[model samples]
Target: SMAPSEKDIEEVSVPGVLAPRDDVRVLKTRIAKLLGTSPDTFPGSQPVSFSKKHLQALKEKNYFVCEKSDGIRCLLYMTEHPRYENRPSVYLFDRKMNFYHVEKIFYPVENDKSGKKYHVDTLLDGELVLDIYPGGKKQLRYLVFDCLACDGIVYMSRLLDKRLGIFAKSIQKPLDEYTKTHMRETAIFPFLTSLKKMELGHGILKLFNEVIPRLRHGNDGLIFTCTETPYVSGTDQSLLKWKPKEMNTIDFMLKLEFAQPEEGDIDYSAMPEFQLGVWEGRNMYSFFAFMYVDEKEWEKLKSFNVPLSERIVECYLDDENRWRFLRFRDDKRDANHISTVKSVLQSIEDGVSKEDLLKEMPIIREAYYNRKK
Candidate 1:
């Protein structure tokens, strides 16, 4: 009955599948073709949740680790806009396969001595985060980690190390030089962009102890990427995502239904029934758990004025084994599949301690050096 406020619009209405505009369908088709996927797909490269077995296999390949930024998973597409005099246009792809047109300041640069250049048909992987500074200022930043293509060159055929090199050369180097020179234009960018800090496996401890703690954005774990492997889509075992036991979470599609009749005599005392759901099929969601919201908190949710139903939400099992709401996962369009939920549950049960991760660094170092030789 009531309209949404500006904050609600910022929180909820900003992301999700942007109906591909008539002008952008060509670009969408081009991106999908480049990835060898359908126009509505290419779920993006997924990382396997880290576990003991994953840790034990650290010596199998040389790995670089980075703090997992708590940000919206996205891919940035940069190409000349057919609608706008061939000026570079950027579109963002989110977890739910949603697309957003992102406008920004771009100054192109060339790697070789040919001429000033701009990368086209270029797609890069990263997470977009809201950086809350010490002084309470917030800035949107994209922490790019990988690249798929740059200027008609495909990187999926290359190793992780070399692909990262491509990302640095084509994207980072140019942005760095431009942002330094054009302070005013940089200030107007929709969001600041930077590469996620990646380090050798031995620096994993420092990431947990120093880097993660000092981050302006939120984080829960580390991602260890094997340098030798080519880009693998859909749960690549080589890309391991490790979270502290307490930080384990699941993304569930939430369903809220009225518990008390509100026809003749409205009953506002009872809270709406909340169901945590899992994906049984692509378009089918089944209830898997009941969310625990006390009378006090239920009222608080109402007073705070947030979406109640059909939201992809993040939850965790409490000490008593009840599903507790962590936050609204606006980035995700769908819930995790049953198999995905089970693995996340198993990871929670078989959690790795910080000390345990550090102890294995020597083994990782040996593996890294051996792989180098």
Candidate 2:
């Protein structure tokens, strides 16, 4: 299977979910609500708005941040996210709300060996899902909306039209057809179904709430499309997703620390001191426990680190950065969690400016270039 790090021969033009700076507050509020926590506990408080200092910081950090697409400047080539794979598959829904992963590669591209390679113009579609394949290795899944090429070939816009358009058309059919067939289609839209006074007008929410639970596999959220949307290559504003509030994501501020497992101390109990986790390779990195705290309290947590048992791994520093908590590990869950130390220094060294911890890879890459004699 293709790993997350695999690069495509063609530039995979998937729908980009760009993190907006102004959305920081909304992100914090939403995440807090999702996690059953309060706004005071929300950690994604940093704002990523650009400034002279931020520009200077970008140069200093070696991120070489540039205005790329849609006027958002981010550090390039930071990490390989597996969540954005450009492949296609089908999702099955059953009466029991049991989700099944059936391997269905619908669009089979045959090689004619008689065409030009138009690598640039195209758009991709699909969602980032959990457990994409049944009994197969589960990782992030990104289904191709379509490619943008000329001739009888599926062009980019048309590909998305076929991909999302067809899916929307399929869903538009009577629910009886969807149920009896045990198959459903997906679509991409340009706008969200607007709500007035918090009451969603369309039957959209009703269909989702009813049909979603009936699907054999888990349905993540809803998508809305509207008029006057633009054609975006990497990311687009045409579509808005409405996942279950409880499972939504928020920006975070955090640090990763290492602890030494004592010899023969193979004690695997439900230790409640610090949160525990296991090795899910996607967002998996070197870190143990995490907590959400306001920016103001970060400093006080840093002063009392113990050398033997625990130390700081990373921390939140300034605006524009937040530590995200992925999931809770049943194996490594603990809560003896003392007030964590401020990981300001370490964060500054390893974090991306999107969340202001500090280490910009572009800068680091240049440093590597300059130091080699």
**RMSD (CA, Å), each prediction:** 6.5, 21.0
- On lDDT, the candidate that comes out on top is 1
Model 1: per-residue Cα lDDT over 1-373, one tens digit each: 2322222322212332364567557766888778776776663789877778877678776678888877688888887765774577777877676777776546456553443456687889888888776675778888888988877788887997788788887778878877776788788876888878888877887887788888887786888888888887667878888887557878898888875464576565568789989988779888798999988878767875766789887787776878877777666657888998988888877767778888888887877777676
lDDT for each residue of candidate 2 in 68-131, tens digit (9 for 90 to 100): 1111111111111123234232222111212222232222122313322211111222222232
TM-score of 1: 0.73
Which 10-residue window in model 1 sums to the lowest lDDT?
3-12
Please, what is the TM-score per model? Answer: 0.73, 0.27
Poorly placed runs, candidate 1 (over 4 Å): 1-19, 111-117, 250-343, 370-373
- Tell me how far the alpha carbon of residue 210 in candidate 1 is from the true structure, in angstroms, after superposition: 0.7
Residue 100 displacement in candidate 1 (angstroms): 1.0
